[PDB]
């Protein structure tokens, strides 16, 4: 699961091997630049302290004219110029070193990740169909996104900051042992707890978001399950139970979040307590050593400061090890993909290529099974020999594998037994790509790339001019719809052929295959949705180009099969019947039976959502008022310690003031712990119950909505669970964290500036000039430490959706062998974010080094002006130290706090969208009782002139004014083509869509005036695909009846009536057996039977069936239908199915054609007048 670190950096140039070495040398040199500034700070404060001690003695005596005072402070004013030169030198060196190290590591990352990305896509276009069938399609795309982002975050910049932190730690210890070791051993005795506190501080500062998603992991399943099955759920009326289950999950999630917030804030409070207790110990022992007359004050400042910076930087080194371990663990998979090579190399030019390509097909003893399900053997040997120009058709029921034979032809796989050959030699020694280009194949359901149609028809082969394009499309007879639409070669077809119709799509797909000019043509169901005349002209064109080529046609319509060369028949995988038309006529087999039968708006109204919980906000604002003013208190106490140690006094007065301030540090630590814990707890509680109540109300206002609001292209299931998962937790940052951060920063900086203006005026004005660049020096470094920006990966994947539409449409391009064109398209689509990445890699280094140098230059300028002010006697050294300490440390605290907060602008926009969802009222209300409530009914339905257009497809009408008359107990079958408005009449009944025109009378009562929930209560259906919920089977069937005490005798009675009682009573924990998502554990016929049992508990007066025997056994269809036939009396029953067994015994039968009712009446009347329903009956009987 992990790679070694030697193999991790293997795709690198000499230039990146130089970039990494120079960017770690400059990282060490930049890392050794803070303790070297502590040396200068110690020696400068020692100069200031020694001049000051000397000064008092001269003062009482007086009478010394001017030179004596001059010379005493002129030595100070002269020596501070040399120390300002030292500071400026360290500042310039740190500027150059930090720019070089950041820029060179980010350039090494950019070049390496570009080569990784190109090699991974080039390897994934060598990987067979079988690997796609075993692994995934969507997890592959998230593997690309996640693994590239994790490599870029792993070897990107964190390897530089790790070496910088190691250099800072080692330089700090070397300085702390070379100045004074007796203090460094005390702080080294402390320093494990210091490093542990810093490590856990950076740890819980790093993640900050994963606990919310692992708390919502248990509740989002119910969300995605209900939003996936929205129409069936509001068709049953089970809003209330799923609402209560969502509540039961959210209470647990909120309680674990409460525990998380309390524990994290206690941890950071204990971190602050340990920092200030380390100050109290360090300065108590330091002033013991100074008043002993053994150290100076500058020696104590240098050793302690140098030691503490080293310990916290080696603590802050901790996230880089985690990021690098994650990069190794994410790199192993991409290295596994780019390592392994298949047996069938689709780019090896060591394949063999024929020249005299003559059409001849040889199959002998061909056994093959799918590697997805290898336990089942579909094929048990097929032997064929097809000559040139021989139109071979294959007939049989669905399940024998005509599509299997087509996929076996193009070498998408290999047969486990035997040997296949094309014109003498076998496929197993000759080239795959040259063979793949010469076999033009149309599959069953083609896919069309969403480019212009000229490029689509160009996609067969490289150099095709428009004259061959026009000849091919006129052969395809697909020029009329080209002529009527604008942009006749410039029309961008939408996603998956949604812009055009199906017949135009299949005709231009035939064109797209014919532009290759192939040697063998293979059609698979080429006229599924096509009409009469266009299939006729397509088949005439197919016979126009069949004389030089070998052809195999698979189709259901026998109009295009009767004019073929050889007809054959599959049975159990084995080709059983052979010969021409009349040979199978006199053979009297299954084909004889077949032919015998056939003849923004929110502006701080986000506080309105949380006006109810005022006391949490009151104690939070109070604790932020206190906890903002703990940097100026630290400025006061630190400045007063050094102001004690500049002037002369008694030894006992110095010891008293030193002990008092080394106690005031510890008092500040305890107050910091208490107020920080209390603020963090109360803002955690307010934000958490805001997230809980807003998730509840957003879920309920989602569930009140119409079906037609859920079919919107902007309102998808993924977008709604994003608006419930990601954006519900983003509304706490617009109010609670915003008030905490604004109040904390005001009491951090305003009182520091006011104290500074009272004590020293001129220096406060100069520092107010230089202050915003130090604040930006806080925020930019804190943004670099923990996730600066993630828009570049979004731009990357938005340009790289070519990869997604290449992987999703892999089934066409493995036939077209057009891999190299897609690889070069990806290589030329990566090129612009490459330049954007290099531009960002220079600009970020420039601005980071500008702020990092402006810190040291602020030190130099502030202390030179303070030296002048002390020398001309307008303030003291205690006051310049107070002004500088308060303003600069307040600015860095403002940066470090205001970078920790989440953003406010996107939080405000997300709150505006959540308020948009909350405020909206649907056109119908499921909770209202108003309408027509009659006490009685009969059960007669009358449709008249009903037209319906889909709201997502307003230009395409699926209905053209149907009408229907249903009476009591009338088994009404609805037969038609796939996609002619079969479930549309169900959706018109169940109050999903209300039609724009038409009239529907339910027993002389119009449905538009009735109660909405009453119609949804009385009837009960079975879905087109059975969906169950994440519980047991007792709660699967128990969902059928709601607002009612569900009796278990009805449960076992319905399980016996649906003949699912056996499969339930066989299972261990029989009525408590936990079923996963959508019934993925148990089989399809069993969940179809439990869907029958779930509809059966409703006892509906109106019953609808939509494909009641899609996947079900022949003995199970009778035991399903016996309960139906004993219970079809009393209730109106309407069954829609493709199997004719429930259609023969039906009462009245209605055939549809493009939405229009063609034939209606009794079954014998439709069997008398031979129309289209006779051809529907003529399928497989006899």
């Amino acid at each position: 699961p992990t790679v070694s670190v030697f193999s991790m950096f293997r795709y690198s140039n000499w230039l990146d091997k130089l970039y990494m070495v120079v960017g770690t040398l400059a990282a060490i040199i930049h890392g050794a630049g803070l303790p070297l500034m502590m040396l200068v700070f110690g020696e400068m404060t020692d100069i200031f302290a020694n001049a000051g001690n000397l000064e008092d003695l001269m003062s009482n005596i007086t009478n010394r004219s001017d030179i004596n005072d001059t010379g005493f402070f002129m030595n100070l004013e002269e020596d501070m110029t040399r120390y300002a030169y030292y500071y400026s030198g360290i500042g310039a060196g740190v500027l150059v070193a930090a720019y070089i190290q950041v820029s060179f590591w980010c350039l090494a990352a950019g070049r390496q990740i570009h080569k990784i990305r190109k090699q991974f896509f080039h390897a994934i276009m060598r990987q067979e169909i079988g690997w796609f069938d075993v692994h995934d399609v969507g997890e592959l795309n998230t593997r690309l996104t996640d693994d590239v982002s994790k490599i870029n975050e792993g070897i990107g910049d964190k390897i530089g900051m790790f070496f910088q932190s190691m250099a800072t730690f080692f330089t700090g210890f070397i300085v702390g042992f070379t100045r004074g070791w007796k203090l460094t051993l005390v702080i080294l005795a402390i320093s494990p707890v210091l490093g542990l506190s810093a490590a856990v501080w950076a740890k819980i500062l790093s993640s900050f978001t994963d606990k919310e998603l692992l708390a919502y992991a248990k509740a989002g399943a119910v969300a995605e399950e209900v939003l996936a099955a929205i129409r069936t759920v509001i068709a049953f009326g089970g809003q209330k139970k799923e609402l209560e289950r969502y509540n039961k999950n959210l209470e647990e999630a909120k309680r674990i979040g409460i525990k998380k917030a309390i524990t994290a804030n206690i941890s950071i409070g204990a971190a602050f307590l340990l920092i200030y207790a380390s100050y109290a110990l360090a300065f108590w022992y330091g002033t013991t050593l100074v008043l002993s007359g053994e150290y100076s004050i500058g020696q104590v400042l240098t050793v302690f400061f140098s030691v503490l910076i080293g310990a916290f930087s080696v603590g802050q080194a901790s996230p880089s090890i985690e990021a690098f371990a994650n990069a190794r663990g994410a790199a192993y998979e991409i290295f596994k993909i780019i390592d392994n090579k298949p047996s069938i190399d689709s780019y090896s030019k060591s394949g063999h290529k024929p020249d005299n390509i003559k059409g001849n097909l040889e199959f002998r003893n061909v056994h093959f099974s799918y590697p997805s399900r290898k336990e089942v053997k579909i094929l048990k040997g097929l032997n064929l020999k097809v000559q040139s120009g021989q139109t071979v058709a294959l007939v049989g029921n669905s399940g024998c594998g005509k599509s299997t034979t087509v996929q076996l032809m193009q070498r998408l796989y290999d047969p486990t037994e035997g040997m296949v050959s094309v014109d003498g030699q076998d496929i197993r020694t000759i080239n795959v790509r040259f063979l793949r280009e010469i076999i033009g194949v149309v599959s069953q359901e083609p896919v069309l790339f969403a480019t212009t149609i000229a490029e689509n028809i160009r996609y067969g082969r490289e150099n095709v001019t428009m004259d061959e394009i026009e000849k091919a499309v006129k052969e395809a007879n697909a020029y009329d719809f080209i002529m009527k639409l604008p942009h006749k070669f410039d029309t961008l077809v939408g996603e998956r052929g949604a812009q055009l119709s199906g017949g135009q799509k299949q005709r231009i797909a035939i064109a797209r295959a014919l532009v290759r000019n192939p040697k063998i043509l293979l059609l698979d169901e080429a006229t599924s949705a096509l009409d009469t005349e266009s299939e006729a002209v397509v088949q005439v064109a197919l016979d126009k180009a069949r004389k030089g080529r070998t052809t195999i046609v698979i189709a259901h319509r026998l109009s295009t099969v009767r004019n073929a060369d050889v007809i054959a028949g599959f049975d159990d995988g084995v080709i059983v019947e052979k010969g021409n038309h009349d040979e199978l006529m006199k053979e009297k087999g299954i084909y004889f039976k077949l032919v015998t039968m056939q003849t923004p708006v929110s502006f701080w109204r986000i506080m309105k959502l949380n006006l109810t919980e005022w006391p949490y906000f009151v104690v939070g604002v109070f604790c932020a008022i206190i906890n903002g003013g703990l940097q100026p208190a630290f400025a006061i106490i630190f400045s007063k310690i050094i102001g004690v140690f500049t002037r002369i006094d008694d030894p006992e007065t110095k010891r008293q003031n030193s002990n008092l301030f080394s106690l005031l540090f510890l008092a500040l630590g305890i107050i910091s712990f208490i107020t920080f814990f209390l603020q963090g707890f109360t803002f955690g509680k307010a934000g958490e119950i805001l997230t809980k109540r807003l998730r509840y109300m957003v879920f309920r206002s989602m569930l009140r909505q119409d079906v037609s609001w859920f079919d919107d292209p902007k309102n998808t299931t993924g977008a709604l669970t994003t608006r419930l998962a990601n954006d519900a937790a983003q509304v706490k940052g617009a109010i609670g964290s915003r008030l905490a951060v604004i109040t904390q920063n005001i009491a951090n900086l305003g009182t520091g500036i006011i104290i500074s203006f009272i004590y020293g005026w001129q220096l406060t004005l100069l520092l107010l000039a230089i202050v915003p660049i130090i604040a930006i020096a806080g925020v930019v470094e804190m943004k670099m430490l923990s996730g600066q920006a993630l828009k570049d990966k979004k731009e990357l994947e938005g340009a790289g959706k070519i990869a997604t539409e290449a992987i999703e449409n892999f089934r066409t391009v493995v036939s077209l062998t057009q891999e190299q064109k897609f690889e070069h398209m990806y290589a030329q689509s990566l090129q612009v974010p490459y330049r954007n990445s290099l531009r960002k890699a220079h600009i970020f280094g420039i601005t980071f080094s500008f702020t990092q140098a402006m810190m040291y230059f602020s030190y130099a300028g502030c202390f030179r002006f303070g030296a002048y002010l002390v020398a001309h006697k307008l303030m003291s050294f205690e006051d310049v130290l107070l002004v500088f300490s308060a303003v600069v440390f307040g600015a860095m605290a403002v940066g470090q706090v205001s970078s920790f907060a989440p953003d406010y602008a996107k939080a405000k926009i997300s709150a505006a969208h959540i308020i948009m969802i909350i405020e909206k009222t649907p056109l119908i209300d499921s909770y209202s009782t108003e309408g027509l409530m009659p006490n009685t009914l009969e059960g007669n339905v009358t449709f008249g002139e009903v037209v319906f257009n889909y709201p997502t497809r307003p230009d395409i009408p699926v209905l053209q004014g149907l009408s229907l008359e249903v009476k009591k107990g009338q088994t009404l079958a609805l037969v038609g083509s796939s996609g002619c408005g079969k479930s549309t009449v169900v959706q018109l009944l169940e109050r999903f869509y209300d039609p724009l025109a038409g009239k529907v009378l339910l027993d002389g009562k119009e449905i538009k005036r009735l109660n909405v929930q009453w119609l949804r209560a009385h009837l009960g259906i079975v879905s087109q695909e059975p969906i169950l919920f994440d519980c047991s089977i007792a709660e699967n069937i128990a969902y059928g009846d709601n607002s009612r005490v569900v009796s278990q005798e009805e449960i076992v009675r319905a399980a016996k009536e649906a003949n699912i009682h056996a499969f339930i009573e066989s299972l261990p924990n029989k009525y408590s057996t936990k079923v996963g998502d959508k019934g993925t554990q148990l089989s399809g016929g069993q969940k179809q039977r439990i869907a029958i049992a779930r509809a059966l508990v409703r006892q509906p007066h109106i019953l609808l069936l939509d494909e009641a025997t899609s996947a079900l056994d022949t003995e199970s269809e009778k035991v399903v239908q016996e309960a139906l036939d004993k219970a079809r009396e009393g209730r109106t029953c309407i069954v829609i199915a493709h199997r004719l067994s429930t259609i023969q015994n039906a009462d009245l039968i209605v055939v549809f054609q493009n939405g229009r009712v063609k034939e209606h009446g009794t079954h014998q009347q439709l069997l008398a007048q031979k129309g289209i329903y006779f051809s529907m009956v003529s399928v497989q009987a006899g």
């Epitope: 000397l54 008092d56 009482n60 005596i61 008043l291 007359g293 100076s296 006094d649 008694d650």
Partner: antibody
């Protein structure tokens, strides 16, 4: 162990120039002042001046300004006093004593040298 | 300039009893604090002047428990109780708390009292 020790006796000529040296050993040399005081034969001690012993800022009594000069040496950690233009009145015994720079003037001169003895003759 | 005036210039103590030396200022040696600074040194013949008492009541470290200072204002006293054969040599009294004349005292020898 804190020990300031000085040079041996001198036997200079009148009008010459002499240099006497207080070498400090056993403590951190860079904090404490060095005060040079003078005892004649059978009189009270008299304070000559002090040298700051960190950077080298001197301060002399008004009787002795110009006829004495203090230097320091941080490498070997000594303090030198140079007399120029000796007369007979400058024949005495000279002592060096330290005094801490943090709480200066509120602390006694706690450690004293053994004192050199300068004998001006002609 | 203040001038200390150490009142005996000889003090014929015996061997094994009490002796008292008395420093006496010319100005009130009370600082603006509550403290009074005058320090008492012993000087042996030919060796370095050790320190005995500082800030008249207190005591240095290493000096035995016989010596004790007292007095205030402008009248200060050192007292040796049970004088041994080791405490012979002059005793002088620094300082002025008004510096930089930084004055000193005369001295007081001790005898054997024949």
């Amino acid at each position: 162990e804190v020990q300031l020790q000085e040079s041996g006796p001198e036997l200079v000529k009148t009008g010459a120039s002499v240099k006497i040296s207080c070498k400090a050993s056993g403590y951190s040399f860079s904090n404490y002042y060095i005060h040079w005081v003078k005892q004649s034969h059978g009189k009270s001690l008299e304070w000559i001046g002090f040298i700051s012993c960190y950077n080298g800022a001197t301060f002399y009594n008004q009787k002795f300004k110009g006829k004495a000069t203090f230097t320091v040496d941080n490498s070997s950690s000594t303090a030198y006093m140079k007399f120029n233009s000796l007369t007979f009145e400058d024949s005495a015994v000279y002592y060096c004593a330290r005094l801490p720079i943090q709480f200066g003037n509120f602390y006694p001169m706690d450690y004293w040298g053994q004192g050199t003895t300068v004998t001006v003759s002609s | 300039q203040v001038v200390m005036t150490q009142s005996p210039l000889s003090l014929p103590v015996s061997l094994g009893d009490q002796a008292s030396i008395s420093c006496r200022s010319s100005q009130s040696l009370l600082h603006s604090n509550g403290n009074t600074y005058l320090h008492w040194y012993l000087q042996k013949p030919g060796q370095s002047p050790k320190l005995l008492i500082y800030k008249v009541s207190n005591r240095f470290s290493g000096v035995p428990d016989r010596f004790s200072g007292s007095g205030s204002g402008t009248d200060f006293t050192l007292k040796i109780s049970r004088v041994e054969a080791e405490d012979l040599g002059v005793y002088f009294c620094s300082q002025s708390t008004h510096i930089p004349p930084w004055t000193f005292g005369g001295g007081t020898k001790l005898d054997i009292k024949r």
